[PDB]
Amino acid sequence: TTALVCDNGSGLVKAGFAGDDAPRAVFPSIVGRPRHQDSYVGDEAQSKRGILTLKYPIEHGIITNWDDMEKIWHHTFYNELRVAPEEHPTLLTEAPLNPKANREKMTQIMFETFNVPAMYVAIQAVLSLYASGRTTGIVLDSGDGVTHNVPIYEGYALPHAIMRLDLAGRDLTDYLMKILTERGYSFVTTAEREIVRDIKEKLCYVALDFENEMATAASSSSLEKSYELPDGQVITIGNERFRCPETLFQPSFIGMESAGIHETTYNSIMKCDIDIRKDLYANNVMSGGTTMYPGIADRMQKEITALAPSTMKIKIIAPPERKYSVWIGGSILASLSTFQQMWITKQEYDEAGPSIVHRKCF
Amino acid sequence: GGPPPAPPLPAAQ
């Protein structure tokens, strides 16, 4: 039949069928339960948020609430895709460096609760690399809850070399709220946060040279944009437009001690085999919603060029469809003849138990 | 000197 592909993110679930060119269902990874003494998922939970307590079962790409995660999976199969999971081999995705115990539990739930006939867990960044038609390269994957640099050799992620930055789209929304508030606007509430996320996604950009852009912003109004709020009134956004995603390059902006995404790209490459470094620099692929800022590829190109040896060939690949590259790469990978050997079958789970995922999925 | 004796193989399935 048709394999399923389910990419569970911190902010958004992307689900659908292997062989399709896009996920059929994309919806918030939220589960709501009544505020007072059953449950809603996704768009309905958001719509009914006034009478629910909303929780995000995935935090920084890692599943942390197993009861609510099972509600997400049940909703995805039965309500969004309208399939019986016992009928479909199921490809799931996981964060880079997802703990052993977690991937075991994922495996156990799929076989024991959902009775899938087969399943596989792939690293999200690895699927984005497949989406770009490559099996060797280094991926920067940046979503709503977490950012990673993941170097990959012949479709195998290299965990010793993986870098994590615990800031991504949600942090950037909050920071933009903070700095617009410093400016004099009031954005504090949940509904106001949603507006700011919209301002972020429509008007922000990554400056080529941050310090110069700050000097420019200060010297004329060519960089200002106006934004019309739901109520109707129109507001002005200035250096905030590029100061917000600058946080990716300078985590000190939100008081994090971590190096920026360009620096961690370099450090990741430098943890890998001397023999594959040239291939990594020539195959940098951007993935995830938070890599959608205008100017980010140019800035990465500039920053990596400065870090690398002076004659290194450097290429940054930033696909237009990169909000969904992880899902798309799962659809591509599950459609390959080479993948049919990779499924963990129910027979293999029966013989080995949940730790089969450590043998089979890497 | 040489390898020790080999133990019996797994059950044939």
Binding site: I274, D275, T338, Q341, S355 | A6, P7, P10
Partner: protein
């Protein structure tokens, strides 16, 4: 019994091109291996790398198994419950490359190399099952 039967067993299903059982205590040696391939030529030095104290240097620029260059993908060789290292060979000028697993028992290393296109998970799973068997037998 003897150790050659282990090679017969490992190679039976056609998914591997090479297989070896190597004693790693004292003076390491191959106990059995596919004739005329790669693992049959593993050296005591290469064994020492696999099992040694340093779990970082083989990331600067890989390691060798019977002269064959490999990159380390996962290293859990000294970790309870896993006892495995996964590797992928490195080749010059797009010649094919292959996945390898090494698992560690009380007295041996079991090594397996897949044929072209065989996924590292099949190799890992086979190598792990044979290591588990050997450990149950105090080997």
């Amino acid at each position: 019994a003897g150790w050659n039967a282990y090679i017969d067993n490992l190679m039976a299903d056609g998914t591997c091109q090479d297989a070896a059982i190597v004693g790693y205590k004292d003076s390491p040696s191959v106990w059995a291996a596919v004739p005329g391939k790669t693992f049959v030529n593993i050296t005591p030095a290469e064994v020492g790398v696999l099992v040694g104290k340093d779990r970082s240097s083989f990331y600067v620029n890989g390691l060798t198994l019977g002269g064959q260059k490999c990159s380390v993908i996962r290293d859990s060789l000294l970790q309870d419950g896993e006892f495995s290292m996964d590797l992928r060979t490195k080749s010059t000028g797009g010649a094919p490359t292959f996945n390898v697993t090494v698992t560690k028992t009380d007295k041996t290393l079991v090594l397996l190399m897949g044929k072209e296109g065989v996924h590292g998970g099949l190799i890992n799973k086979k190598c792990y099952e044979m290591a588990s068997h050997l450990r149950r037998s105090q080997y």
